[PDB]
Amino acid sequence: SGFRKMAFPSGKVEGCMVQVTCGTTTLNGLWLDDVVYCPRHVICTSEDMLNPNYEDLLIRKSNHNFLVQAGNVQLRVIGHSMQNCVLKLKVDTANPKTPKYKFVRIQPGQTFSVLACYNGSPSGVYQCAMRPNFTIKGSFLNGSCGSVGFNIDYDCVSFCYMHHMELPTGVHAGTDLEGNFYGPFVDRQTAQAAGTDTTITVNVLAWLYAAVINGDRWFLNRFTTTLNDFNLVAMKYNYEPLTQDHVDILGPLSAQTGIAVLDMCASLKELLQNGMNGRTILGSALLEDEFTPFDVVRQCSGVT
Amino acid sequence: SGFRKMAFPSGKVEGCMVQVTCGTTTLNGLWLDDVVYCPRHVICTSEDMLNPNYEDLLIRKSNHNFLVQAGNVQLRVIGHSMQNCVLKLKVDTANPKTPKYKFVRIQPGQTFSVLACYNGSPSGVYQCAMRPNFTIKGSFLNGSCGSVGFNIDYDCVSFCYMHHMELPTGVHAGTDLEGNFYGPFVDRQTAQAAGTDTTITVNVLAWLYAAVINGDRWFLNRFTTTLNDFNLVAMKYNYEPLTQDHVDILGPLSAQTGIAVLDMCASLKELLQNGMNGRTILGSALLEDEFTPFDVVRQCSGVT
């Protein structure tokens, strides 16, 4: 028993972190096979960030200008190319620690672990969710760019995020491993604002199921609702509209607890309408939305 | 910017996890050099757990009864001994992945990362605190016994916890790596209750400093208080009494923000007396106490 915001073991990803320096800028790179992936803004100075022409800036850079270091050993750069907002540095040595890996672009609402790094060295690991407004609420400082987000499936690491930018509002923006930003963000020091951040309703429900499995049942009421009646309340509280796909995905959690999805929705509706009244659910005084139904099933069944 | 419940990178500890089987019981072991450490209740059946005589039970066990597996390779057991509530299985092969390590017994209020494991395989990593009542609020299922708690200092892993038991109340109990339980708990299936769980005041204050550094300043008021006046309010809310050592430890956070410790105490006092009024601090609707002043300084400065 017990329910915690759990991250995947980071070992396989730690073995891939390198330091990439270009000029005066140092950030993190991801070394997989003979390619080092890093944010393309490594080629910029803070002056360039106002309106960078990355194609023009990259033209003044050669293989020998990109300093790549894995631990205290220097990697030899034999190629460089820009793919969207990431640079791919071809090195002459394949990473001996490359795990089985995939590059996947995640959907808003899905979760992933971040291995926060500085100078190619890991400092910490935490669990995140790709917010519906395509931002992530991470913990990143200067030097953390190039830190990656991933999921693990037994032995296969699915890389889904590379950290690029902190918005003036304190939230974080980045790309998938093909260099495409999540959301409308651009790698430029300009006024960019995150849109409305809605709550991932399906994740809140999955977390309510985790609370029930783990003993917290005070919020269960004698009521039920319909998908349309629940969504009228979800819109008012800036919650994502619940779809039949969401109800289907919650199926195994509903089967395990013996509580129908629409019954759990009625409990959620009353929690939204009346608040927690000073009570907690899984040690939290607010509705948690960063656990997918997959995360709940995984944590409650012990998937290694 | 951003503040997250961060765990240490788990790679160095993953390389130490093994599976220990004795009879029908399978749990996790920690392989360091030529010794595998695991909970001694590995030698018990659920029937023995009611009133186990571990010395008598261990007498019926030989080296060949302890099956140790690191991945899919079997380790040869050449010795076995009981040290308090842990078994130390001497193997003929030193772990090639043994990091620089220490065994340390932590103080209540201090934090550490847990690498939750099943069958010697890691499933997740999360940050915990040793509660003042010597329990931990973890996420552990059947098979998780032997999962360890640790801290990292550059390259040195300090092992501080081994998971042993879940109390009937859903909280967790375990030992240091010498087999001594934290608290009054015994490895027996008997009625054991966790005492009163007080809030780690110094950690709450450090987290208020993290909130200020990271932008959340709504709770800052025009007041101050004294150590004695603050502690009168801390007692009423089951908060640990704040000592001058705690004020001293908060020194660097007070120096960084320019807010005196006793001024932050007055903000905390008003938060205890009036609640959050539906507002949040660092995305939390309750006062967080599982970040030490060291964790805040570490996260906000990027220690790798």
Ligand SMILES: CC(=O)Nc1ccncc1NC(=O)[C@@H]1Cc2ccc(F)cc21
């Ligand atoms: C100074 C600090 O702590 N900065 C960070 C913190 C957390 N995460 C990232 C950064 N870095 C940036 O946000 C730089 C500035 C800018 C503009 C566009 C862009 F694509 C990347 C960047």
Ligand SMILES: CC(=O)Nc1ccncc1NC(=O)[C@@H]1Cc2ccc(F)cc21
């Ligand atoms: C069944 C399940 O999930 N159990 C766990 C969950 C989480 N953590 C541990 C366990 N295991 C126990 O608590 C066993 C029972 C007992 C009594 C004393 C003792 F020293 C160890 C144990």
